């Protein structure tokens, strides 16, 4: 289970290769998740400066207070 | 009860949304400081070589490989 | 090893050959360094009079107090 | 109502099935780093003994017992 | 205690007796260490020229950046 | 403040004076500590040779691996 | 499971309330010692100038700028 | 960089002109020094007999053992 | 974001300019915070000697043991 190849297909990692790229950890719902959010995604993105933030494509009703961006 | 579980979920959400203090600065500063020390350690041998009059090829360094390329 | 050739590619030395030129010890980051500073340099320069000083090309927030230009 | 209790049970099951990362790596790395530092602290006394010309029996180590056997 | 005999079973010192031998400081894990790394070793080797290096038999993901060789 | 007198009643320092006694840093729990361990003590002892060690009177299951003596 | 989250919050509060030592003393002492060494390095040249009989303007100092003004 | 005119304003040299005066090397903190000791001073004074001593106006707890006067 | 001006309106820094004044890190609550504690503040104060302490204007019912001053 490395950054290049994760254990499962639902988790993807964009690893920067230069000082001007931003890292990303993306997870796509599925399997035991609800039908309404079956194919949505939640991502943690890290800017080159080193700042982490969260985002998601799920509807605003289901969005937690920490990822309403 | 449902409200207790929702409170637990809310607390989990608050805990997961903590602010990261941007730790890159500390690591970068420490690495630059250690490179500073490593490179400054060679000032003694360089100065002794220069004041002795040796050529570039005749100055023997005590340098060892550093995990940081600097 | 020697001033003319060292055992590491990331460390270079400019050795004076006359009495009117300066000496320099330059180190380029890499390998186990952070990606943000993966190609910057830190140099100790020595004037012909015999004065040593430090400089670096990393960002200001990474510079220690001893190498502030 | 029954559906509320079933939703509570489902939430409990969801929370209980959280993915736990392999925390063994964290502790192992920390312990290895600590042992690295502790053993590297003896390089000063070993080098001074060697450069002084003392024998193995005459080299006094300031070693203290470490809870990690290393 | 001394280089010839130490107060801990898990710490050993190989002290050179001539100009062509290398010094070694070896530590074997155990006691309060993790079960996975219970019987591994970490060593510092000093060549007769006077160069220090680190090595370890622990798994790759547990090695720090310093002892990655 | 000082080794002779500290600003907290729960912290005591035993300072060597005759070059043959041990130094001690003792702390008694209380205030915001748990009721179960309300009046136990944790001490650091330094032998005249200069070796530091930790001890505590708390129950075994509350002891960290470092002070398990 | 609410009690587990409350215990986690209590542990977080305990960790956040760690007593920070007055680290100003260490930094101040180190800076004062460094300035002491740099200023004492000039004693050699000052003594040689005085014992040689040179004037203040004729005494050459090999002084280099120090990031600490002292 | 001479005794009469030092390189920087933070260093002052009091050079004797007769056989009865005392020499002095005074350094005032600043620039990259701590804010608490921003305007204190450390002096090395030399009596006409040729005895060197050190004095400092910083707080007692910051004084090294050499300049405890 | 710097000490002079931060990137958030709810966080302010009182930075000392001399050796006789204290430092402060103050943070007000807002948006995602509860309505009850909406406009309260939590502050970290550093005395000129270098001692850090915490205080808050919220009710003692919500006060953690660390900042219960």
Numbering used by the authors:
A (entry chain FB), C (entry chain BB), E (entry chain CB), F (entry chain DB), H (entry chain AB), I (entry chain EB): 79 to 147
B (entry chain BA), D (entry chain CA), G (entry chain AA): 9 to 78
Sentences from the paper on this structure:
Single-stranded RNA bacteriophages (ssRNA phages) are positive-sense RNA viruses that have shown specificity for gram-negative bacteria by exploiting host retractile pili, including T4P6. Acinetobacters have type IV pili (T4P), which are involved in twitching motility, surface adhesion, biofilm formation, and natural transformation in gram-negative bacteria. Our study delves into the interaction between Acinetobacter phage AP205 and type IV pili. Using cryo-electron microscopy, we solve structures of the AP205 virion with an asymmetric dimer of maturation proteins, the native Acinetobacter type IV pili bearing a distinct post-translational pilin cleavage, and the pili-bound AP205 showing its maturation proteins adapted to pilin modifications, allowing each phage to bind to one or two pili.
